A paper describes a structure:
Within dendrites, β-III-spectrin binds to actin filaments to form a spectrin-actin skeleton underlying the plasma membrane. The β-III-spectrin ABD comprises tandem calponin homology (CH) domains and the L253P mutation is localized to the second subdomain (CH2).
First, the density map reveals that only a single CH domain is bound to actin, as observed previously for the α-actinin ABD. Second, the bound CH domain has an additional N-terminal helix that is tightly associated with actin (red). The presence of this contiguous N-terminal helix unambiguously identifies the bound domain as CH1. Thus, high-affinity actin binding, caused by the L253P mutation in the CH2 domain, is mediated through the CH1 domain. Collectively, these data sets, combined with the cryo-EM structural model, indicate that the N-terminal sequence is critical to binding, both directly by interacting with actin and potentially indirectly through allosteric destabilization of the ABD, the latter of which may alter the ABD conformational ensemble to impact binding. Upon introduction of the L253P mutation, the distance distribution undergoes a shift to populate a longer inter-probe distance, visible as a shoulder to the right of the 4.8 nm peak. The ABD is then relieved of its regulatory mechanism allowing for the CH1 domain to interact with actin filaments, aided by an additional N-terminal unstructured region that becomes helical upon binding actin.
Residue numbers in the entry:
A (entry chain B), B (entry chain F): 1 to 375
C (entry chain b), D (entry chain f): 1035 to 1167
Amino acid sequence: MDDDIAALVVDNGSGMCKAGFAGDDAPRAVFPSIVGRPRHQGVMVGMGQKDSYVGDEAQSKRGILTLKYPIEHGIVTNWDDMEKIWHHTFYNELRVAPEEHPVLLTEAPLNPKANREKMTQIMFETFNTPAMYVAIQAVLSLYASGRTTGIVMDSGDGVTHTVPIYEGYALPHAILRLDLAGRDLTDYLMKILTERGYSFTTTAEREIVRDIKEKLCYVALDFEQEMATAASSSSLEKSYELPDGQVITIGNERFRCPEALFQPSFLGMESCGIHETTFNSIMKCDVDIRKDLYANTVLSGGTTMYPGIADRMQKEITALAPSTMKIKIIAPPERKYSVWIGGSILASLSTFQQMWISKQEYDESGPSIVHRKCF
Amino acid sequence: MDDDIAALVVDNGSGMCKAGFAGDDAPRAVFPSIVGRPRHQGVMVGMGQKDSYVGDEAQSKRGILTLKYPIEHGIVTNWDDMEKIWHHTFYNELRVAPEEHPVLLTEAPLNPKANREKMTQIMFETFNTPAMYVAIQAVLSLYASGRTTGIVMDSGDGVTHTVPIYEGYALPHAILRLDLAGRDLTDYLMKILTERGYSFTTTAEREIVRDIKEKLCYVALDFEQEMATAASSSSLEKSYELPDGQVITIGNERFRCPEALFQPSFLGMESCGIHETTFNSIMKCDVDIRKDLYANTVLSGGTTMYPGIADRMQKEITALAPSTMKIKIIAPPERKYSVWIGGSILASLSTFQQMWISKQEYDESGPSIVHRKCF
Amino acid sequence: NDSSSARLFERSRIKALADEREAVQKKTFTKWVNSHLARVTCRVGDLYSDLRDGRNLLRLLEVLSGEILPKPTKGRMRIHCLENVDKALQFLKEQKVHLENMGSHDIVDGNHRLTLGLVWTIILRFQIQDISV
Amino acid sequence: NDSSSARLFERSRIKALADEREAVQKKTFTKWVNSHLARVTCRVGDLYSDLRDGRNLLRLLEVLSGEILPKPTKGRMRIHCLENVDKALQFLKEQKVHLENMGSHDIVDGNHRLTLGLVWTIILRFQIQDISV
């Protein structure tokens, strides 16, 4: 392990890949799960051909390039582009052959079956992986949270989860994924920012208003009162600056964007806010252990990086659950990264080091033993 | 290459032809794209017949001769006279058979299709050209500027351009040509010099007041204040001398002539000054890369040879663009000639040496493959 | 809810572990390349500047493969340098070093993580694939 | 914004490359013409003065084509010289050497770039076209 055999932990979450060797506290490779592909032509002799920009360089040439996630909400859409962000991960950040290493991958739960076995296959077959393991996100964020009791809410870039647990025992029927994450809120931010007259009809600036969002857009603790004092703009309005140099001013549009996490009717679905979803998970749980799910609501993921989330949570599940007892929420730092970090310590455990899908284990037995090891 | 096969670079810009072999730093052939044709008759036995004077000798006999550009603003008007300045180029300056050489031609972008395929045809067919390439002007001036990022403004003798670029990728919809160059400003100089009583109703002296212009007529940094101190003539007035020996005095008429580059209402059109045109190009560009178009506005061409241009530019796009960031303008020497020089180094690149329209490539396939190679 | 300033600390340690990688790795390359460019008597105290033109990366690939590669125009200008690395990339895509952000301008700019990201992939295809002679 | 004095340097090197062309080219013509006018025992140390009258260019065309051309009036005067070169130009436009600034007075004045611009086009139509015998 650890630059030896050294299980590669590669968190292939939507929006961002986060990769490092086993035991690493910091995924040295972090870069957006994107593939830049040029739109306009260029007649210049001696110019980077560069048909397929990949990952973080596509952040540099966002104007020309069509930015494209190869994955969508855990579901891998484009497999060779997925292999572009992989092979770039393994040869330009990890800078090593997976042909030696186990590859501890990370994947969203409640996954259609091709996105486990093919996510493993392009590792086993295009790459060589002497071993590997695709892994459920929220549990590994509990590995960096390091606990075994409560309910983990991993809102990465694509999917919010509510994954319960009680002393190592998970409750699968009470696990709920949901599409409320940073990829969604920037579309809501797009439709709600243009009422001020600012249209950004290009993915280049979808990530830039997502950058606005990941800085400015917090969660209203109470919502319509922040909209009530959105009448008199005192501090809610703030100036942002573009890479062009232009200035934005956003007021109420700040807090209401991640209110779609909490009132998805702003998006316009059936979906309740994330607090009713964890509460709905605990509906499905057992009256002895439902107490320990209240006081141990865990937060995780890149969309959960925003201010005002967790206090609205303690307010609202207090409104939902028996307020006779306590509803503490545990929101550690590095919650986007705790998914990866707890994997980077999972591979360190030698009992896990027998829980790998080895090479011939994939080859002769099946791609369905991926499902027998990863559930 | 280089007196071997040796791609002939021939910049057929309006006003001036500039030609040399590949790799040459200096177009040995520079002479005005004109054809001198006599007006008055002469009964002298033993006199140069010389029906068709061509090029620089027509500068000698400007009185008798009707000076005539065979090209107009990139659009070739007279094709056989175009072949006169060509065959004079190839047999009295380049002094060699194009029957062996590639001919790296230069042409204005956004060209109607006959001026590419016939500009190539009279090369392929009247001459023989085993290969050749007609080429966009501003990009080749970027080849002598040697960069790949910014926006090139090539104001030769006929056409001002604004051709954006970003790391080899051009933005075609944001490319804008415009008729504001030395051929236009001398007509404005004609109509504005006769208010002092000096009429020059002959093309002979149109080039002479263009010579006044290319010496005296700079660009007012601020305009109407230079017209305000045009009340008290202290230094703005200066004496010029004619080939006849007569004296001119011009004051304000100096700076306001190339102000028509910046306020084409002095000509009387819709056209905005060149600074609004590059600014209008960057309107059409992508917010990530629009920053690199501001700080890398490139200048090129024979009309851009005048003083006071580029500081008025940095003043005025500062007034136009986000002044939060920087608007540097890069005005190298030899900007009339950088169009040619960067072509003379383009042919040196062996990847370009597969990008030639070869002979049978023209003959059997098409004249429309000129468009498939030159865009 | 302090994952943000913790991200300002973590990412500093993300690339601290990556710089502790890439510097020793640059010296892995450095003694590796000065074991080869010493055949053409070129010495490397800095990958990011010596092999920056592309022609010097072309010299390396002429050493490793023991072959000859075209040397196009070079000078001050960007196109001069990009063309040279585009011949290196011609032989490196010939050797299946992809354009996964392993670029012309990445060598010309001397991008610390992709200049080494290119040439370490050259190590990972020299001792794996036939970039050698 | 200094393309102007740079033009005073560049154009000096424009015609420096053209003089490095036209002088060696004049000696290409010189040993070429003294390989021919030595048949009529005329020696050329200077194109621009020996073949200046036109009649001496007529002597060359009488050698190359191996033919006879009319020798009209010659003397001190300009018309004397222009007529002689107008017979040379008669046989040279007969040989399709155009009047693209390849002139009577250009030979009479001894114009450095068009006297050689004429007779190098004579070389480019001797070893291409039938100015020869």
